[PDB]
Amino acid sequence: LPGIVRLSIALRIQPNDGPVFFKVDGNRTIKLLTGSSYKVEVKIKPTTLQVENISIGGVLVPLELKCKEPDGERVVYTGIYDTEGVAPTKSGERQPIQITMPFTDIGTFETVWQVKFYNYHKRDHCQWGSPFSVIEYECKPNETRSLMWVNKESFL
Numbered sequence: 791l792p793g794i795v796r797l798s799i800a801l802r803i804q805p806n807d808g809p810v811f812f813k814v815d816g817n818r819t820i821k822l823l824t825g826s827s828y829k830v831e832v833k834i835k836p837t838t839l840q841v842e843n844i845s846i847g848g849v850l851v852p853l854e855l856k857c858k859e860p861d862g863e864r865v866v867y868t869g870i871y872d873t874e875g876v877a878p879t880k881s882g883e884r885q886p887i888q889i890t891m892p893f894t895d896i897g898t899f900e901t902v903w904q905v906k907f908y909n910y911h912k913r914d915h916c917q918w919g920s921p922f923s924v925i926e927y928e929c930k931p932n933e934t935r936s937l938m939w940v941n942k943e944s945f946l
């Protein structure tokens with residue numbers, strides 16, 4: 791419908807392009823591996839939208855426009871998310887990490903994931919649970935509640 795942005799985010803662990811899983815804590819915790827890397831696949835509509843990248847916990851993931859969604863109506867952007875240098879989660883089974891994705895001249899998508907970062911050599915602790923193919927978001931750049939960018943303030 792007019793003014794609805796739909797975006798899905800998928801992660802596939804390298805080198806096998808395998809699935810990513812969540813666990814329930816208290817409430818969905820995404821299980822991610824440190825010292826590793828992920829294919830990131832972003833599917834957007836409308837197809838007139840332009841994304842340049844996605845940032846995950848402060849890590850920049852440059853996105854490249856790839857093609858039209860096989861068997862679908864979105865456009866597909868992919869990049870590689872590098873988790874080399876990310877600290878494993880030390881306590882409390884999860885931690886919040888910031889997701890940020892700018893759409894040029896439309897607005898910015900932000901959300902918080904709950905994540906457990908696993909030590910590289912505990913990949914067998916990480917790669918199991920409930921696999922999810924994507925996280926699907928419905929976004930409204932002109933919702934009443936969408937915070938407008940304040941470009942300037944002037945006392946007159």
Ligand code: NA
Nearest residue numbers: 897931932936
């Ligand atoms: Na807006």
